[PDB]
Ligand binder design. Structure first.
Ligand SMILES: [Cl-]
Ligand SMILES: [Cl-]
Ligand SMILES: [Cl-]
Ligand SMILES: [Cl-]
Ligand code: NA
Ligand code: NA
Lengths: 68, 67, 67, 67, 68, 67, 68, 68, 67, 67, 67, 67
């Protein structure tokens, strides 16, 4: 029947976790069609003088493949 | 001694991770007594036109059992 | 030497596990060349009134990269 | 707002994997409402004179909770 | 064929691992029928002035379900 | 009390999962005594022109050791 | 070449995940030098009358070691 | 240099964990030479009317292989 | 808020599992303050002529940090 | 902020581990831009008459995506 | 169809990783026939005054079972 | 009675895996006494113009504690 594909991305953001996630999805939408779900694999980040510099969320984005 | 039980729930929310966790805890409080701790197992979600449709957090809720 | 690539697909089917795997592989053949092997990562599915609605097999497909 | 609950069951059958899964779902449908999805956690079984005696599929059944 | 259900419990005890396990099983038999097997998932505990305060054993208890 | 041993085998087959499992158990029966249970660890396979060429199921076979 | 060390901390906060993480990092910078990155290992918490009492984020903090 | 081999065994005992472990080692000593170490993989068991019927410890036994 | 630290120790003992855990906690108490909880990660050991030479339990010890 | 993508490759070589890794990176450089980091997931290989025939290293290559 | 067996070995060497793997495989050749592949499970070692004393590679060796 | 402690380090080197491990052990020897063993947890690295820029090996170093 239907077949999906999953790509692994790493969204980053200085705002927070949800922001990093949306950042990855926003870019995914530019080149991938039929985005359906995502799964968080890792949550990490860089440290600056004020604490967290950047949040980095590693996630898998699942999307439906078309006919051909 | 004391004995606890753990149940696995998946709280959802279009707002955020904390909201999804709270949603699951809110519902848990209605039928389970002595809620003590939770452990997040998975974080996933669905995608819509604006990006994240709903955040889904799989978590285990531990509570103390009576008698 | 030789270098391979692995892509993650999710084949579905209402018939069974083998069918879901085949579905994923059939679509893979359309856009990928030199498909060599697959590894099943997860087996899950949706539930309907008759039980299993659709079986969903998450798998990795390995194929030889050209050049 | 929505909240789901997952329970772990072990379906068994002498027929095969799919049958063992259906067996667990069939029994689940008797006491649980709004069955949505299932995840296979382990596949094991017992051995008899003719090979596989009984297939045993440990799976999680997710279902939606009423507010 | 037969169907089983597994529940996750945490048995505790100041005496030891075996005691913690038994404590969990003892309570399990008061509300669950047809207990067949258990599986240890975690072993943790709290620390007191004399070392271990209480042992905590997270385990899954498997029991057969009645077709009703 | 009693003691068991577990060996890891990989059964293969062009027909399906159950068949690959059976193939491993069939061969295990020829040199091992008191076979009791099995656990599936991995499910993988090779790809051919028609899709799945061979299904490969890695499993652990548990058997009682004699004293 | 360079060598790094990782320490495991648990930051807590009644506000949220990002806050818990920052709390851990804030304390980390008082005794550790050259903090470079962090990795979330677990997310758990305690439950109170209003739901989440406190969020607990277990994380690893990586920092560069000084050759001395 | 040296090469070791690991076999997986399941020791059982009604006494307790340590007992099940020793049970597996005792039998291992009968047919395997140069036993060096063991690693516990799983701890499970059966349930009887008095609680735990049998403890079952799944472990790997490592031993040194000889010349030929 | 409060911040904890976790250290990983491997307590040993020729007596048993509980003893090995205690051995690690005893030593921990000498240089670490505010010990709160422990988590067992691994259970292994060495083998001698009488069977188990020494039990080794890898565990993490969590304690609250000051200021 | 920025977004990265990770692809899974398997580099192979008859000489060793580093060589297999390099082989994967060499090929990755031909079609992927902004390669930043890699992570080794698995190390396996084939066996021949002289021992190791080919070393196979499965790794993830992370690279920055352009906007 | 064909059935394979996997045994777990631990090769050691003071020279390096590849050497430890080869050591395990060389001894394997002495008593096992039809060695086909290996999978590295762990990489550990002992420490001496000069740093690494011996590298120890835990691996699984797959081979075709006869008949 | 004996108690060990494990610390997690990340050794780096542009030479190779073994070198990165030695780098971590070398630095470890400067502040830690009774280094006994090490376990490799991850192998990763950075990518440069020529392929691997720097190998990074995350490992745990076990050492014996003084009573
Ligand atoms: Cl791709
Ligand atoms: Cl329940
Ligand atoms: Cl430290
Ligand atoms: Cl054997
Ligand atoms: Na948040
Ligand atoms: Na004990």
């Amino acid at each position: 029947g239907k077949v999906y594909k999953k790509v692994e991305l790493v969204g980053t953001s200085e705002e927070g976790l949800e922001a990093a996630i949306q950042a990855a999805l926003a870019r995914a939408r530019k080149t991938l069609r039929h985005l359906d779900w995502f799964e968080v694999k890792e949550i990490r980040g860089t440290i600056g003088e004020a604490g967290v510099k950047e949040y980095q969320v590693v996630l898998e984005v699942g999307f439906r493949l078309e006919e051909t």
